[PDB]
């Protein structure tokens with residue numbers, strides 16, 4: 275067992291004194307390990323925390339070149355480096371106030387004036403967050419103790435998150451105060467909710483845990499290394515016909531196959547030649563299932579969400595359309611009759627430049643799928659192909675501006 279340079283428990287609980295005392299000692303310790311470029315970036319964060327954090331959330335959805343060209347990128351990289359420089363040797367429970375809207379809870383838990391939360395609102399929230407996984411991204415300031423009478427409590431919802439071992443964590447001094455920065459970039463599940471009391475006021479204390487997954491985002495190189503490490507031998511695991519049908523599908527056969535599946539052709543107008551191809555691709559995706567929890571990205575178009583390019587509801591530049599889309603699709607299961615093309619990379623691609631929906635899918639361990647880019651000769655970038663007839667539970671929808679165009683990020687989980 276590793277002896278920490280500055281000893282602490284996994285949870286400081288309500289002990290603000292010992293927490294701040296440890297946070298000050300560890301801010302001082304890490305300061306010494308930091309680079310000038312990193313220290314300078316931490317000074318840039320103090321002043322412009324909101325814009326720097328908003329950037330770190332949606333930076334990986336732009337083109338590879340737009341990332342290298344952005345004036346906010348070096349600052350992101352340095353801050354990322356400073357936090358990643360101090361990975362925790364053991365877990366740490368962190369505390370932060372969250373909006374219930376972060377979990378698609380559109381109802382008011384309790385007003386500022388109100389002290390009580392009703393059983394009705396408590397149970398409705400529990401029903402909303404239960405059996406779901408929500409992605410948490412971008413730079414965030416967190417607390418190392420449970421807030422008390424004297425501390426700032428901006429929402430009736432308190433997140434009590436267990437950050438696992440090797441999580442990047444950066445404690446730092448900001449004038450007289452001390453704070454801890456995390457980059458996030460993980461799936462959380464809320465296991466239990468408790469109605470706690472802080473200074474004669476009710477608060478929902480959400481017990482959250484990190485459900486580890488691979489998320490390469492814009493690091494398509496690291497993902498390509500992963501996919502090839504696991505799927506460089508996938509071709510030899512298939513029968514000559516399975517490989518032939520997989521190659522044919524990837525080399526342009528996908529159009530006839532997916533259109534046939536979307537139109538319910540196996541029932542309406544059966545094509546036995548296409549049915550054999552489908553049977554073979556599906557079996558090939560079941561040979562070596564996704565070995566670890568893997569986050570994939572899909573540039574989705576309007577028809578996938580019952581819309582058209584001419585549809586006024588697809589204009590996400592009008593807020594009313596984002597609200598309408600969120601209302602209709604949050605908490606809903608999205609079925610794909612066709613095989614699904616996804617990438618290990620979140621970056622924008624030339625062929626899907628106009629696609630206003632980014633489908634961020636969390637593939638759980640053991641799901642049918644394969645990294646097809648481990649087979650040369652395919653138009654697609656860093657592809658992972660998901661089985662036909664897959665269901666995606668949309669947990670949360672977020673917007674962002676890809677220049678003039680407002681686009682959506684749909685946080686979906688592949689349902690087994």
Ligand SMILES: NC(=O)C1=CN([C@@H]2O[C@H](COP(=O)(O)OP(=O)(O)OC[C@H]3O[C@@H](n4cnc5c(N)ncnc54)[C@H](OP(=O)(O)O)[C@@H]3O)[C@@H](O)[C@H]2O)C=CC1
Pocket residue numbers: 528529532536571572573574575576577578579609610611612614615616617625626653654655656657658
């Ligand atoms: N899209 C991506 O993020 C990725 C794509 N690729 C590559 O992109 C190329 C073309 O792929 P792509 O367009 O994604 O392939 P699809 O088979 O998914 O889509 C082709 C057409 O089908 C429609 N469509 C797709 N899914 C549905 C659905 N469930 N219901 C209704 N209509 C649907 C699309 O319309 P609409 O868009 O309006 O729904 C589109 O016009 C291939 O070479 C592939 O390898 C590779 C990796 C990732």
